[PDB]
Design a protein around this ligand. Structure first.
Ligand SMILES: [Cl-]
Length: 129
């Protein structure tokens, strides 16, 4: 599924991401835009044999198990295939674990480079929430 901006904002708000661990909702919407272009089936392979999965590009070395990544830790305790659903629940629940691990939203490279330091509340402007 490809989400619309406000459609995704509403879904993320229902799942408790607004202000979660100090990160306002616009951070999460901006991260999804630049990580996956709002596509729940986005996948990207890395040089270490890991793959990033889904709307928040969750990595298979640390967080989900895809059965083909050396050194897998599976800290979200979820198959990576569940993160390619059109329903974002599994992705959101794993993202909550990632942001609590320690280093905030710095796990998301596209967030660090393209969202952090900008007015991210613009990403939810005009949405009914
Ligand atoms: Cl899998």
């Amino acid at each position: 599924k490809v989400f619309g901006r406000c459609e995704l904002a509403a879904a993320m708000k229902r799942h408790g991401l607004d202000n979660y661990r100090g990160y306002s909702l616009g951070n999460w919407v901006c991260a999804a835009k630049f990580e996956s272009n709002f596509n729940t089936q986005a996948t990207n392979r890395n040089t270490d044999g890991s793959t990033d999965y889904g709307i928040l590009q969750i990595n298979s070395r640390w967080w989900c198990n895809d059965g083909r990544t050396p050194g897998s830790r599976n800290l979200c305790n979820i198959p990576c295939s569940a993160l390619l659903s059109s329903d974002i629940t599994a992705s959101v629940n794993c993202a909550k674990k990632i942001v609590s691990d320690g280093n905030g939203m710095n796990a998301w490279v596209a967030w660090r480079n393209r969202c952090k330091g900008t007015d991210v509340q613009a990403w939810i402007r005009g949405c009914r929430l």
